[PDB]
Target: Solute carrier family 22 member 12
Amino acid sequence: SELLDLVGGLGRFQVLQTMALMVSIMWLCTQSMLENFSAAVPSHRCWAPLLDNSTAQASILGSLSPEALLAISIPPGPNQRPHQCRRFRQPQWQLLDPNATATSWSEADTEPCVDGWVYDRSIFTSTIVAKWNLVCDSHALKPMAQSIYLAGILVGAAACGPASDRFGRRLVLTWSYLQMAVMGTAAAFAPAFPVYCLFRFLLAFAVAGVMMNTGTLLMEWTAARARPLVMTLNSLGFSFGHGLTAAVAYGVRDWTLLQLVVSVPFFLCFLYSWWLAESARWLLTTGRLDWGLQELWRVAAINGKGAVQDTLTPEVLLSAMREELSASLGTLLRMPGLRFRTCISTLCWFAFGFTFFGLALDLQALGSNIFLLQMFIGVVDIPAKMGALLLLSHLGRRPTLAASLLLAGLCILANTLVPHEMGALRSALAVLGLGGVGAAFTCITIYSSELFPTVLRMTAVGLGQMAASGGAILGPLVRLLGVHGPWLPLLVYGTVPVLSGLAALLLPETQSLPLPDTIQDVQNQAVKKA
Ligand SMILES: O=c1[nH]c(=O)c2[nH]c(=O)[nH]c2[nH]1
Model:
């Protein structure tokens, strides 16, 4: 802490780091809501000879309107729209006669689209669903692709955590940037759906790596007074990423060009990312004085602190480290106070992700334009984050986290009690819910990054990220369980965050302790707590 005070805590370096990493987080959000947009399902119909063959119109003596041909070729499906997956195969000319009931056909007259589909290009010129036939039998495979992505971020977090702790944050972040950029462009140009799925998997490895290493490096270089503000800026990075996604997708509506446009900035980001400084503190806790000295001298020179360059001799630093000198997940899970801290963090992360996907359903009731909906999500997410930052600065982290989860759960229960016809009240509760989940995200990121000591912190944050992805993955099975009664999903969506807030109330008070660097340090606050 005194070394950081010597090097300073409100200089140009932290400002540039915050801006550059917030922009990079914005682009990771663009990748995630790229996956929210690619494979949107347009209205579809069977391919029909009489419709999509100039010779078949020239063989018809006369003229029929396109609406009449559509009625004559494809039955109306659910919601008075054309049936998406069925055709009559031959034109039912009696249906033009007004003396015909709509039931003058048999189930034997319908067959699946065996010869494929004609896709509407009015909104989107091309999507993976129209190109790769992700309709009918593969409609459920779409949630499988989302499931693969979320499993990829989970396993990536579980693997990249210990790797980041072993090799350092700057190196793993840089390698994550390279892997994400290359694999994302390869995913954009993939010939087959399994190859796309593989590239999405390897991209998800790097999204998890980037998120962890940006948060980690930010905590290690920011003075304690500025840490909430800087990560709040990062969470606004998520909201601005949503808004940027909406803007780019509105401007570029072909998925290949959109994916390429979203992947190129991470190559440019990597190019400036070689300049990024590694965490001095992490280098410091592992020893290796000469390399830590070199990094401190470089950052001091970049920060304009040459008067600190002339001071700080190795004898003084060795004297200051003599007192400080005087791993596997199983180590994290075997000592009770960090087992307990990890378990509560992991449960709260699980509750976060699960509450997120569940709450997001409501957003569909407000209207239709997906671009406008994403923009409105970002715009509403921003002031909630600002309020979260002020509450985190005044009251501290634990009461704010508990209040945010309690508000979320009470909001979900109120959504359970609101009639479906009163859609405006449902919308209002949905907006309050989304604000609460965003505030909870900022709380969980601050409290999880601050709760664990540096040597095991990355392993614990990785396991937490695994828990959030576990909630997200467990989600679709609870929506498929939703068939077993309308009250079960809402009951689960209400019970999980209330229980998580109650568990979050079972945490040790923070905001006035020095950050723990070693496991031995952790015992000293516990004795003080006892
Ligand atoms: O960066 C993310 N972390 C998550 O845990 C999560 N869950 C979800 O649905 N989307 C995202 N995005």
Remarks:
- The two ends are 25 Å apart (CA to CA).
